[PDB]
Amino acid sequence: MYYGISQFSEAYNKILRNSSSHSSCQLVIFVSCLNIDALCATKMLSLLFKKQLVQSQIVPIFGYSELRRHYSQLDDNINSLLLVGFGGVIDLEAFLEIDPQEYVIDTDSGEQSFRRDIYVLDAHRPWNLDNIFGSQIIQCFDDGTVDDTLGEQKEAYYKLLELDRKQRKKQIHEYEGVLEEYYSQGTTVVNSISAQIYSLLSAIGETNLSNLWLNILGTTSLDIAYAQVYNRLYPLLQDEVKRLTPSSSVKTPDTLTLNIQPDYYLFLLRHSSLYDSFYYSNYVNAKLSLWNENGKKRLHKMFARMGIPLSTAQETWLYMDHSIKRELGIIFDKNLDRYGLQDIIRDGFVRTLGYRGSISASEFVEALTALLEVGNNSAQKLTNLRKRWVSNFWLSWDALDDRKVELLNRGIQLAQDLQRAIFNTGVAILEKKLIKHLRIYRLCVLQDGPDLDLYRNPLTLLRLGNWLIECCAESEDKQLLPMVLASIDENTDTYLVAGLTPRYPRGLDKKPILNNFSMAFQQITAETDAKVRIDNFESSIIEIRREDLSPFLEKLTLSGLL
Amino acid sequence: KFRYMPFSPAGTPFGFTDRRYLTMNEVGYVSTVKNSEQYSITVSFFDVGRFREYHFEDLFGYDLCFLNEKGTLFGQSKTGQIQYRPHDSIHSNWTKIIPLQAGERITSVAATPVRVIVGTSLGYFRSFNQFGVPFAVEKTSPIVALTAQNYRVFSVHYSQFHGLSYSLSELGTSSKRYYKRECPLPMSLPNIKDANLDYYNFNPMGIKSLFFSSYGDPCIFGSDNTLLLLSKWRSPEESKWLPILDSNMEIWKMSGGKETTDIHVWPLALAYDTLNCILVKGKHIWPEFPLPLPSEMEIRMPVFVKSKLLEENKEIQIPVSMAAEEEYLRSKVLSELLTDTLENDGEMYGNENEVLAALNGAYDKALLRLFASACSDQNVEKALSLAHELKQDRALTAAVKISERAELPSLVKKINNIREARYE
Amino acid sequence: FRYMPFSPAGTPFGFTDRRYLTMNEVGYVSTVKNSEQYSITVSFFDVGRFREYHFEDLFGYDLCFLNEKGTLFGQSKTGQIQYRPHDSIHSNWTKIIPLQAGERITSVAATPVRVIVGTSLGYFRSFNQFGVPFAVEKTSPIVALTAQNYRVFSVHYSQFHGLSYSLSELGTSSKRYYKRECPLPMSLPNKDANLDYYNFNPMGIKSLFFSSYGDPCIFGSDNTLLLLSKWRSPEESKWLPILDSNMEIWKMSGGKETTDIHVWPLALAYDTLNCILVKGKHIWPEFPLPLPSEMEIRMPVFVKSKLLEENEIQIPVSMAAEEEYLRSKVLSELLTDTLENDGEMYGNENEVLAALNGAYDKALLRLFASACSDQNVEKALSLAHELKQDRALTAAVKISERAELPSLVKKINNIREARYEQ
């Protein structure tokens, strides 16, 4: 509520009024690492502050305790704080021990001012009502859901705070019931941080092709589990592409172009073979069931039907005969309807410059996600491991630059290897039937397997989780159920547990489903004495000990908040 | 018969592309992009520090724009839909539909600090204020071109039964004085292949641009590629239109005498002795969306004949005689303009008096170079007529020395008689 | 439009090697085509002042302005103009005017102070008498120029402005435009002589000059000499048609329409148009150019039908009285306009005002007698309102007592008392 979209520009002006000083650094941007959206958002923010000369300190943070450690050691000279990708769910005054009495300067007249501004760039739609309403210091960059949906909770909270027998109980318990109905609600995303920051850049006037491409990457990175967000934000990106494109031509070494062209829903089409692109795609294995041998037979049969030889299909896309790849849209239109792959046809954004080849938005965001993942006494191991993924995040930041395409090709190769590992472990799960039905949720526990040291990473376990949700979503015989995905780390000796939401099949076209695992995780942590970690910014990511795993799952299946 | 078209200053046609520039001037450029039956309008500014550029989604299909230092006025010609947007976003934008008859289109719009001016194809002239209150409904000859700078408004009218004309006014917050009302305009309309016909179907008048100078003198750029400045417009009995750039001739002059077609001048503004304009290269007159840096073209008085420049050059190098002639004429007209603007409107900076003194210096130096060529041909009477127009007493002694070098003692006696007249 | 070159009182070739270029009150300029070479003969009517001269033309000078001190030739295609002073103590000079593609010089003018070039795109260019330029200006496209005593009368025409005229005057300090591009009331023209002349001169301007007292005068295709009256005050300016020459030739021939007698104007002095009376199938002078006759100014208030039913043509008394009254009125206001600003020029004018006011009052008394003949009281009183001096009212009260009409006398005596008392 404190910043609607039409005054994002005003908020940026306030940042200048606290940070446009050549002598000292006064702006520190806390970025949630291990998120593509926050990475692109901070890249656009860093370009904007570089063009206007604002001093900055970009700090990547993994855990909530890491946030508290970094905020506790901050100097008092810093007056502007930007929280990218997080800070929209928890109460920041109750977490960062913030009291407004020692941070207030020049209160005199009903005006209040503070010596530090903390801005929140968060996409998680459960918004803390104290944080968004009763807080002057914590300033939210709201998408606009407060003006449409959160009005009843606004008046309930305001008459709760204003009024500190049957009338008092009858109104106060009703407003607290409304507030507790808004609370204990699942977590969802309907807007991207990159779209909000590009709206800020449109309000200022610093938009160009690079910021538009970063906005395209940030919007495209949410297409895996939040396809309604991408389908909503696609026409604005189409309007911006057709606005900032030039008039027209011959391929020349300096002309960067960014076209809206058919970019099919495939894993790494332009940097791998067509056989490996269909074989490692989540949607193709989701529909044709490629995990068993019959699916591979059907894939070879449709290669026979499409007229593409397996010698030509297994050849690299750049070296592929273009009698196959020029009329590939016509072949896709004629042949994919019989096998159910009609939804492969999809228009996306493809950027190229010079003579170095074309890259799509989807291939670029899988390359960036791979560079986040495997880009490079137990508490020291956790600290070193958190430092390792912070180094991975900065390597992926280095890959965002135009002059560092070798990092991009390294990310492409890492994405290929990681998708091979994900495919092997996915068919490992599916062949031996470790998926167990618990009547309210589906349980998948990895005890041992091939290269299990990749799954101490969060996004690799989320990649396996989205693989399983896509593979099980097209099977209509089992209905929509939430998924618990646990992976064991022997050296740390902890089960890292991820909560995965189900989704409808991609061909259908409604209300998005929520993430009800954080409420149960918090309630079990409060009621039981489980030594667990809640510090991840995605609240469905927890770490349990091995010996406390089965009581945690029994208390999870006893609880009805799934 | 004749068809009217909506005009904005230095606008570009669509052509084969899907985008065009609505207006281009010294403040900035406003361009529109076709966006699948709607439009996206981007307003960019040449002054980054004062104004921040913006863009918006236009659903009405605006084909008219006017851009000044305090607002932006968009106008749809077919439906009468106009909109005023202040730059500071403190005053609110306003949107108004004016009454249009059948066959009536808004041909041109203009904005003033305290007024907003809309002109229609049947000759109506509707003036609002800056906030949307109507103020006047005048009927004039059909306005096909408007450009306002501060409180001064300059317009061009054309009709079959009236002919081409111009009107200049200064409305102000007070002292409402109209300088000239529908006096005839000395400009050549174009001689009505597809590279020119794509533009002349869009802009039949041949107005490439219409603006004011940096000191407030009106300037127009017709289809003959000459920049006409109105001199002494404050006094209506002494007003005259001075051509100060026949830009085809200087295009031919920088190309080494080659009859050059593929380069054109697209005018934007006139600073003192310099037209800022994009030299557009290609078969199309209008520039495209990757807008290059606007080049600078110094104004030259059109006294250059191509025959003599081809005769002496057996880069076109002008001989010192006609170079002195054009420097003398250009210095005289610029001295008159600077003297009028400094005496009437005052100096807006501190530089105007010293540049006027240096301009009179360059005036006298060119007059002495004409005096030398007169004395080289034993022409006493032409030398006396040249040094009779010599302004300052400092440079008359140089003419005495040239008379000594040319051995014309009667010229010495008459110049000393001129000095005797000049001591009192 | 054609935009053919114009020189005042210029004569076309018309399948003939010899044609004239410019005829004024001072002389005439003629050209002869000879073996792809032109021979320019200039000849002055005042043979006692100085001598006529021939020279050789290798350029094709189709433009000429002739004054009392020099001769300015101009080439319409190449732009090469040339000023030749008549006396040999002043040297000739030659200039090449810059011209665009398809641009021609339409008319030139030469003053003792100024040298003027008018151009088909409106490029009004000015020089002094020694060729140093003073101004380059764009106007509406020139089709006619004349100038005397740093006064410039121009006529413009274009397809986007129409017919117009300008009345510039250059003092030593600044320019002054009296009437800048105000519309001109000259009628443009609509068989072999007509086709030859309107191929040569499509505007139909036969001549265009100043009067002897500085008043602009124009003679176009309708054979109607117009004078610009009250031009010193631009809010009061009237274009007076002072000569309808077709009416004068019809009156001279004796009530018979003729097709072999026309007029070619040269100049206007006070009450007299100095002109060549041409005789022949053509309307322009031929090689034996006659002595320049003079035609009196006659205001066009003559009805052809009334004059043919009445009858050398014997003019009736009332129409002659109206003619004298209107001509005396316009000449009185013109001469009072000239002497109250420009002063005396020949010094005889102070008696010309007295004699012309006497003629004005005399014509008003003949109109008084004509009105009192039909016993109209109020029309005669309105005539008696306009009497100038007191001595006319003695003859007025003499007429009214003769027609036994005291009701006129009772008001004329009051008018006289209010005149001499106040």
Side-chain angles (χ1 to χ4, degrees), chain A residues 1-380 382-510 512-562, chain B residues 1-410 412-424, chain C residues 1-390 392-409 411-422:
Chain A
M1 191 45 148
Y2 189 77
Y3 284 120
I5 62 170
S6 166
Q7 65 183 177
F8 290 167
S9 163
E10 180 181 1
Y12 163 73
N13 284 302
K14 201 182 171 202
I15 297 169
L16 292 201
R17 294 203 332 270
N18 295 358
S19 296
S20 172
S21 85
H22 59 83
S23 63
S24 303
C25 76
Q26 293 215 247
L27 170 53
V28 175
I29 311 168
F30 286 165
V31 55
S32 63
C33 70
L34 282 72
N35 201 358
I36 309 298
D37 213 18
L39 165 66
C40 297
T42 314
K43 193 65 170 163
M44 281 166 318
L45 282 179
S46 180
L47 288 191
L48 166 69
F49 296 145
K50 178 147 94 63
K51 206 164 189 182
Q52 306 272 357
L53 286 149
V54 194
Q55 317 291 320
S56 179
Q57 183 178 182
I58 299 157
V59 175
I61 305 156
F62 181 76
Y64 273 130
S65 171
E66 183 66 26
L67 182 63
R68 204 196 297 187
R69 156 191 306 126
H70 286 330
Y71 188 72
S72 178
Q73 68 185 358
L74 268 181
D75 195 42
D76 298 300
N77 200 6
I78 310 298
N79 49 3
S80 288
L81 213 62
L82 266 75
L83 267 63
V84 184
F86 68 101
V89 177
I90 62 170
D91 206 338
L92 272 298
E93 293 83 3
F95 182 76
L96 297 179
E97 64 208 290
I98 295 299
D99 206 317
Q101 300 313 106
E102 68 269 14
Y103 271 25
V104 63
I105 285 178
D106 194 28
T107 191
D108 275 312
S109 179
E111 52 93 10
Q112 292 272 10
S113 71
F114 288 95
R115 69 183 196 83
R116 181 170 282 161
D117 290 331
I118 302 184
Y119 303 95
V120 175
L121 294 174
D122 175 75
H124 298 125
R125 295 297 90 193
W127 278 104
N128 214 336
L129 293 175
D130 294 331
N131 181 310
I132 194 175
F133 286 150
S135 184
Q136 184 171 357
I137 191 150
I138 302 299
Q139 304 160 67
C140 298
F141 274 54
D142 202 81
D143 169 69
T145 183
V146 65
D147 286 354
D148 184 73
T149 315
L150 189 63
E152 272 198 3
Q153 295 92 304
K154 158 177 189 158
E155 61 88 20
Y157 179 51
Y158 269 129
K159 318 177 175 313
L160 192 149
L161 62 90
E162 172 191 302
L163 294 174
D164 299 295
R165 205 62 264 168
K166 60 213 169 310
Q167 43 264 60
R168 154 184 297 189
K169 290 319 199 294
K170 183 177 69 177
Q171 65 182 357
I172 284 176
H173 205 186
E174 166 69 65
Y175 291 148
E176 288 169 308
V178 169
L179 190 146
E180 208 72 24
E181 191 40 64
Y182 169 68
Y183 283 175
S184 163
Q185 200 183 2
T187 300
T188 186
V189 181
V190 301
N191 204 11
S192 81
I193 317 291
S194 299
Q196 309 182 1
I197 289 170
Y198 190 75
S199 69
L200 182 135
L201 260 62
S202 296
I204 298 303
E206 306 270 351
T207 67
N208 52 4
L209 277 174
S210 290
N211 291 318
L212 187 153
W213 173 244
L214 292 165
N215 186 24
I216 278 181
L217 294 176
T219 306
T220 297
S221 71
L222 282 51
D223 207 13
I224 297 300
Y226 299 99
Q228 289 94 18
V229 188
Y230 183 73
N231 290 316
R232 185 153 72 81
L233 291 168
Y234 184 35
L236 321 183
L237 300 180
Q238 268 191 349
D239 293 318
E240 279 303 281
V241 164
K242 292 187 285 184
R243 181 176 82 84
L244 281 153
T245 181
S247 293
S248 43
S249 307
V250 61
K251 279 205 57 54
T252 50
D254 296 355
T255 56
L256 193 171
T257 186
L258 197 152
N259 304 325
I260 304 162
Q261 70 180 64
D263 176 35
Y264 321 107
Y265 203 53
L266 306 174
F267 182 78
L268 284 194
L269 171 68
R270 299 172 175 82
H271 289 275
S272 296
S273 82
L274 184 48
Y275 168 73
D276 263 8
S277 71
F278 287 167
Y279 189 66
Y280 286 149
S281 162
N282 294 358
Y283 193 57
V284 183
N285 190 359
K287 289 189 134 60
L288 309 164
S289 73
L290 269 71
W291 48 277
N292 50 20
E293 190 276 331
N294 285 67
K296 291 185 55 78
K297 277 173 64 48
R298 189 181 306 102
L299 188 71
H300 295 318
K301 280 172 182 174
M302 62 95 78
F303 284 163
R305 194 146 301 141
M306 290 171 69
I308 308 182
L310 262 69
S311 77
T312 311
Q314 279 190 321
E315 185 144 330
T316 308
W317 178 263
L318 182 83
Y319 293 150
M320 172 185 248
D321 194 9
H322 63 86
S323 287
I324 302 299
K325 76 200 298 189
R326 178 192 47 191
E327 55 265 25
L328 207 56
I330 295 97
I331 289 167
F332 282 172
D333 186 74
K334 269 205 164 180
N335 290 296
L336 293 179
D337 312 317
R338 284 177 284 176
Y339 289 85
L341 290 183
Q342 165 59 233
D343 219 343
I344 292 302
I345 301 299
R346 169 190 325 270
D347 291 331
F349 309 99
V350 164
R351 169 189 172 250
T352 187
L353 73 165
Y355 303 136
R356 67 169 78 254
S358 297
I359 192 66
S360 79
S362 312
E363 293 179 353
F364 207 110
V365 299
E366 310 275 9
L368 289 177
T369 300
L371 276 161
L372 270 299
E373 283 169 66
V374 177
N376 283 279
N377 186 246
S378 43
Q380 201 185 301
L382 268 72
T383 317
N384 189 359
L385 177 51
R386 289 183 176 193
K387 285 193 293 296
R388 187 273 303 278
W389 310 270
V390 172
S391 81
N392 273 357
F393 172 75
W394 278 125
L395 212 65
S396 181
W397 174 280
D398 271 308
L400 267 180
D401 193 308
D402 201 301
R403 320 155 314 156
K404 312 217 200 174
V405 287
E406 314 308 306
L407 275 297
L408 175 61
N409 295 322
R410 271 287 303 157
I412 290 298
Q413 296 224 59
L414 282 177
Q416 293 196 70
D417 282 1
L418 260 61
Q419 199 74 25
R420 287 190 225 206
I422 281 293
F423 208 87
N424 284 353
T425 308
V427 305
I429 291 301
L430 284 187
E431 271 155 50
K432 72 203 309 166
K433 274 202 81 203
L434 291 174
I435 298 181
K436 304 154 58 50
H437 203 293
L438 273 299
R439 168 219 48 92
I440 180 64
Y441 77 105
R442 285 185 258 178
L443 173 68
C444 177
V445 175
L446 275 73
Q447 310 268 16
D448 56 358
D451 200 0
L452 215 63
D453 291 331
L454 301 183
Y455 289 163
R456 55 162 55 103
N457 185 284
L459 305 105
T460 317
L461 201 67
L462 276 296
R463 181 163 278 172
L464 181 62
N466 302 321
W467 200 97
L468 294 174
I469 300 299
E470 288 277 312
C471 202
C472 291
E474 300 277 353
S475 73
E476 198 269 330
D477 291 331
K478 37 194 201 191
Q479 59 185 241
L480 281 73
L481 283 172
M483 182 165 297
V484 163
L485 179 57
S487 177
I488 178 164
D489 189 359
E490 293 283 338
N491 180 227
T492 300
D493 210 312
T494 51
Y495 273 97
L496 191 151
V497 176
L500 277 296
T501 57
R503 50 168 157 276
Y504 303 105
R506 202 84 66 169
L508 275 297
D509 48 351
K510 55 187 291 183
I513 193 67
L514 307 183
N515 197 2
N516 295 315
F517 271 116
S518 68
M519 32 170 76
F521 282 165
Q522 281 160 266
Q523 211 154 33
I524 290 158
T525 301
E527 293 179 353
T528 65
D529 215 332
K531 33 187 292 186
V532 288
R533 311 223 79 190
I534 209 61
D535 49 354
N536 204 70
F537 289 143
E538 294 205 16
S539 44
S540 77
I541 298 314
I542 62 170
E543 323 185 33
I544 311 168
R545 310 287 289 181
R546 175 194 286 133
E547 299 90 12
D548 291 331
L549 183 67
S550 291
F552 201 97
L553 276 296
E554 285 210 4
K555 294 288 183 176
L556 189 145
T557 190
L558 275 184
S559 169
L561 288 191
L562 306 176
Chain B
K1 284 182 175 176
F2 189 74
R3 183 177 292 171
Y4 286 99
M5 275 288 158
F7 170 76
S8 289
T12 61
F14 268 116
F16 303 131
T17 62
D18 62 358
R19 73 190 304 164
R20 80 194 193 88
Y21 285 99
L22 285 185
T23 185
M24 294 174 32
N25 59 5
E26 59 265 357
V27 185
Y29 52 91
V30 179
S31 64
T32 174
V33 187
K34 204 152 291 203
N35 204 352
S36 305
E37 304 306 309
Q38 51 198 51
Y39 293 86
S40 55
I41 291 178
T42 300
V43 179
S44 296
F45 296 97
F46 290 142
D47 205 313
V48 179
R50 294 179 66 188
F51 315 119
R52 296 199 310 220
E53 70 97 19
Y54 59 93
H55 72 95
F56 71 104
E57 190 73 28
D58 170 39
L59 301 192
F60 304 97
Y62 297 136
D63 44 359
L64 287 171
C65 186
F66 187 79
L67 174 63
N68 47 317
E69 312 217 330
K70 280 175 283 289
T72 303
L73 171 61
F74 297 101
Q76 163 73 261
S77 65
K78 296 170 265 196
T79 71
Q81 173 94 10
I82 71 163
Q83 178 180 9
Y84 184 77
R85 305 181 60 117
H87 288 154
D88 56 354
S89 197
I90 296 171
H91 313 283
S92 185
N93 315 323
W94 57 264
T95 303
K96 188 156 281 286
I97 299 98
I98 75 160
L100 294 199
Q101 280 71 59
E104 189 158 89
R105 296 171 71 179
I106 301 177
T107 43
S108 84
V109 289
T112 300
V114 295
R115 264 186 185 218
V116 160
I117 294 168
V118 179
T120 78
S121 68
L122 294 174
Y124 286 82
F125 188 89
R126 299 171 190 278
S127 301
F128 318 95
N129 55 1
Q130 45 179 325
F131 308 122
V133 180
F135 264 62
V137 185
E138 192 184 357
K139 202 173 182 293
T140 62
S141 290
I143 308 105
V144 303
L146 287 170
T147 286
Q149 170 207 81
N150 297 344
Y151 301 113
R152 264 177 296 257
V153 176
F154 181 41
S155 65
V156 169
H157 321 261
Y158 182 79
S159 180
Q160 300 223 10
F161 323 101
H162 303 125
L164 192 68
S165 66
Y166 72 101
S167 312
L168 170 63
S169 305
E170 185 178 2
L171 61 84
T173 177
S174 287
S175 79
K176 187 90 162 182
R177 186 191 168 194
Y178 292 165
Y179 287 114
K180 281 163 162 220
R181 303 304 264 185
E182 300 186 29
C183 287
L185 175 71
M187 183 180 72
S188 60
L189 293 195
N191 297 114
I192 294 157
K193 193 182 288 184
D194 288 6
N196 305 306
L197 286 186
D198 191 27
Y199 184 67
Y200 287 137
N201 284 353
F202 163 71
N203 187 245
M205 295 296 172
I207 309 281
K208 287 191 180 177
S209 199
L210 182 63
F211 45 88
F212 279 82
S213 59
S214 291
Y215 297 142
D217 307 311
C219 296
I220 186 168
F221 202 90
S223 80
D224 44 4
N225 305 322
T226 187
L227 177 75
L228 312 166
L229 192 147
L230 180 50
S231 180
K232 274 163 160 310
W233 42 272
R234 299 172 173 90
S235 55
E237 62 255 8
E238 312 178 42
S239 314
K240 57 176 178 291
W241 278 91
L242 297 180
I244 56 172
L245 262 171
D246 176 34
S247 77
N248 289 357
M249 181 45 188
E250 293 83 4
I251 275 171
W252 177 90
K253 194 197 303 148
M254 42 155 278
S255 74
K258 178 183 61 179
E259 283 285 339
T260 310
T261 304
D262 62 357
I263 187 167
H264 312 267
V265 168
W266 202 252
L268 260 64
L270 181 80
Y272 155 72
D273 83 13
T274 294
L275 181 90
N276 289 92
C277 56
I278 296 89
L279 285 157
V280 168
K281 59 179 71 65
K283 214 72 61 193
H284 287 321
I285 319 168
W286 55 91
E288 292 291 328
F289 166 66
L291 197 76
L293 267 293
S295 309
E296 286 212 329
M297 271 195 88
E298 189 168 8
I299 55 171
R300 304 264 168 240
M301 212 74 188
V303 298
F304 288 131
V305 65
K306 286 143 102 192
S307 301
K308 287 187 183 294
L309 301 186
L310 286 190
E311 271 275 290
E312 183 178 1
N313 284 317
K314 46 164 170 303
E315 192 181 59
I316 301 299
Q317 289 184 354
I318 298 104
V320 290
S321 294
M322 58 187 308
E325 178 186 65
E326 63 88 19
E327 268 163 39
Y328 151 75
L329 268 177
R330 195 244 306 162
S331 296
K332 204 189 63 156
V333 297
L334 282 192
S335 188
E336 284 188 349
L337 287 170
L338 262 172
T339 314
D340 291 331
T341 52
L342 190 150
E343 191 82 6
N344 288 289
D345 221 332
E347 51 186 60
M348 84 197 55
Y349 309 125
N351 205 337
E352 293 66 2
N353 199 289
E354 321 285 348
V355 72
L356 177 56
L359 187 55
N360 280 5
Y363 182 51
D364 284 5
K365 292 273 156 176
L367 269 175
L368 290 162
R369 222 178 308 152
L370 288 187
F371 183 88
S373 278
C375 287
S376 301
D377 279 27
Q378 293 84 300
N379 205 348
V380 169
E381 53 256 49
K382 184 175 165 176
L384 183 63
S385 163
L386 278 166
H388 187 193
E389 295 293 326
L390 203 56
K391 186 178 288 294
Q392 281 171 359
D393 295 19
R394 174 181 101 161
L396 281 158
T397 58
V400 176
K401 303 302 140 186
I402 301 299
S403 73
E404 290 299 89
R405 210 171 318 280
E407 291 94 7
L408 312 170
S410 310
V412 188
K413 188 172 182 173
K414 292 183 287 293
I415 294 287
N416 280 119
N417 295 359
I418 291 300
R419 292 266 273 279
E420 164 73 23
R422 283 292 275 278
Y423 303 121
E424 200 266 332
Chain C
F1 201 64
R2 303 212 77 218
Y3 282 124
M4 295 298 103
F6 170 74
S7 45
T11 298
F13 274 126
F15 44 87
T16 301
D17 49 351
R18 155 92 73 164
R19 89 186 173 102
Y20 296 89
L21 294 188
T22 299
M23 311 186 257
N24 292 318
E25 52 268 48
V26 295
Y28 54 97
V29 177
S30 55
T31 176
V32 171
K33 183 164 46 184
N34 188 10
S35 308
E36 320 273 0
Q37 187 274 330
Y38 302 91
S39 178
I40 301 299
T41 293
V42 307
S43 178
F44 298 94
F45 292 125
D46 193 5
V47 293
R49 197 177 293 173
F50 50 92
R51 176 143 291 102
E52 58 198 295
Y53 63 83
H54 323 267
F55 72 96
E56 166 144 22
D57 173 352
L58 301 174
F59 312 97
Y61 289 144
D62 42 1
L63 286 147
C64 183
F65 198 88
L66 174 72
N67 50 69
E68 69 275 16
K69 272 146 100 153
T71 318
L72 177 70
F73 298 96
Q75 218 271 334
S76 66
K77 271 87 68 179
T78 61
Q80 177 163 315
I81 64 169
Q82 162 165 41
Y83 187 73
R84 292 166 145 279
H86 299 147
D87 44 352
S88 304
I89 210 68
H90 304 136
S91 186
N92 314 326
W93 56 264
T94 307
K95 185 70 178 175
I96 293 191
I97 298 290
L99 296 174
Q100 293 184 10
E103 184 176 272
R104 310 155 85 81
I105 299 183
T106 43
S107 66
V108 301
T111 304
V113 176
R114 214 161 151 211
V115 163
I116 305 165
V117 167
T119 315
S120 77
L121 267 74
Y123 277 82
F124 198 77
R125 295 172 178 272
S126 174
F127 305 89
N128 49 7
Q129 71 254 18
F130 311 117
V132 175
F134 280 0
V136 183
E137 177 186 339
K138 195 163 173 169
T139 57
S140 294
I142 301 299
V143 296
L145 281 183
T146 194
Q148 71 155 34
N149 278 47
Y150 44 71
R151 281 184 186 142
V152 192
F153 181 40
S154 62
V155 166
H156 323 275
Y157 183 81
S158 73
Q159 303 224 310
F160 317 116
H161 303 119
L163 192 58
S164 52
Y165 70 100
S166 304
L167 198 52
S168 302
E169 167 151 55
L170 187 149
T172 67
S173 313
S174 174
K175 206 54 179 294
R176 206 206 158 183
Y177 274 69
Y178 281 79
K179 316 183 83 64
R180 169 180 258 274
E181 300 189 35
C182 281
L184 189 68
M186 182 179 72
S187 296
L188 272 80
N190 308 95
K191 267 277 189 169
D192 47 353
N194 309 134
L195 294 174
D196 279 331
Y197 191 64
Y198 300 130
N199 271 277
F200 165 69
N201 201 16
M203 294 299 291
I205 316 166
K206 282 187 187 177
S207 180
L208 187 152
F209 46 89
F210 279 77
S211 179
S212 59
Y213 294 71
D215 295 301
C217 302
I218 185 166
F219 201 99
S221 66
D222 46 348
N223 289 337
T224 300
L225 171 75
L226 319 172
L227 194 150
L228 179 54
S229 182
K230 278 266 180 62
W231 58 269
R232 290 169 176 81
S233 57
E235 311 86 40
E236 284 190 282
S237 305
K238 318 163 271 284
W239 271 105
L240 298 179
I242 55 169
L243 183 63
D244 190 351
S245 181
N246 296 334
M247 181 46 68
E248 214 276 339
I249 301 299
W250 185 85
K251 206 183 315 298
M252 203 279 267
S253 304
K256 295 180 177 67
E257 303 261 342
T258 179
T259 46
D260 54 350
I261 297 169
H262 307 101
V263 65
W264 205 254
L266 278 70
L268 185 68
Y270 198 79
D271 209 9
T272 59
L273 181 73
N274 200 5
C275 65
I276 288 303
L277 270 162
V278 292
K279 300 192 176 70
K281 204 172 314 299
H282 295 329
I283 65 174
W284 48 81
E286 61 166 90
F287 181 76
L289 190 138
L291 279 75
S293 70
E294 69 275 16
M295 270 185 37
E296 284 269 350
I297 288 155
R298 294 283 162 232
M299 304 280 323
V301 298
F302 292 131
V303 185
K304 266 195 211 212
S305 71
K306 191 164 285 186
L307 285 178
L308 68 94
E309 66 183 1
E310 162 63 42
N311 284 258
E312 293 90 5
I313 297 187
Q314 298 187 358
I315 301 299
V317 56
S318 199
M319 202 166 325
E322 295 158 77
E323 182 57 340
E324 294 293 328
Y325 161 68
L326 291 174
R327 196 187 77 254
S328 298
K329 180 183 177 174
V330 298
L331 282 182
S332 67
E333 65 183 1
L334 280 169
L335 208 46
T336 300
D337 269 331
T338 61
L339 281 71
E340 282 256 19
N341 189 179
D342 294 329
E344 283 206 314
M345 182 179 71
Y346 290 105
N348 204 21
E349 293 83 3
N350 212 45
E351 299 267 310
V352 176
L353 276 296
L356 191 143
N357 284 9
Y360 183 89
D361 295 320
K362 188 66 177 181
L364 273 180
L365 294 174
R366 313 171 81 280
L367 274 172
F368 203 60
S370 191
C372 287
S373 294
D374 54 278
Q375 292 89 21
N376 205 338
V377 179
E378 58 267 58
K379 162 151 156 50
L381 172 43
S382 75
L383 285 163
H385 268 93
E386 296 317 294
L387 308 183
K388 290 288 283 186
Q389 58 187 357
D390 190 359
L393 282 72
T394 59
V397 72
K398 270 194 292 167
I399 293 162
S400 52
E401 279 273 357
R402 190 181 304 143
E404 60 167 331
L405 203 48
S407 179
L408 266 170
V409 184
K411 327 287 304 174
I412 297 169
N413 224 27
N414 177 250
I415 287 304
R416 187 163 196 204
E417 281 173 20
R419 193 168 292 215
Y420 86 87
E421 183 178 1
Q422 291 177 328

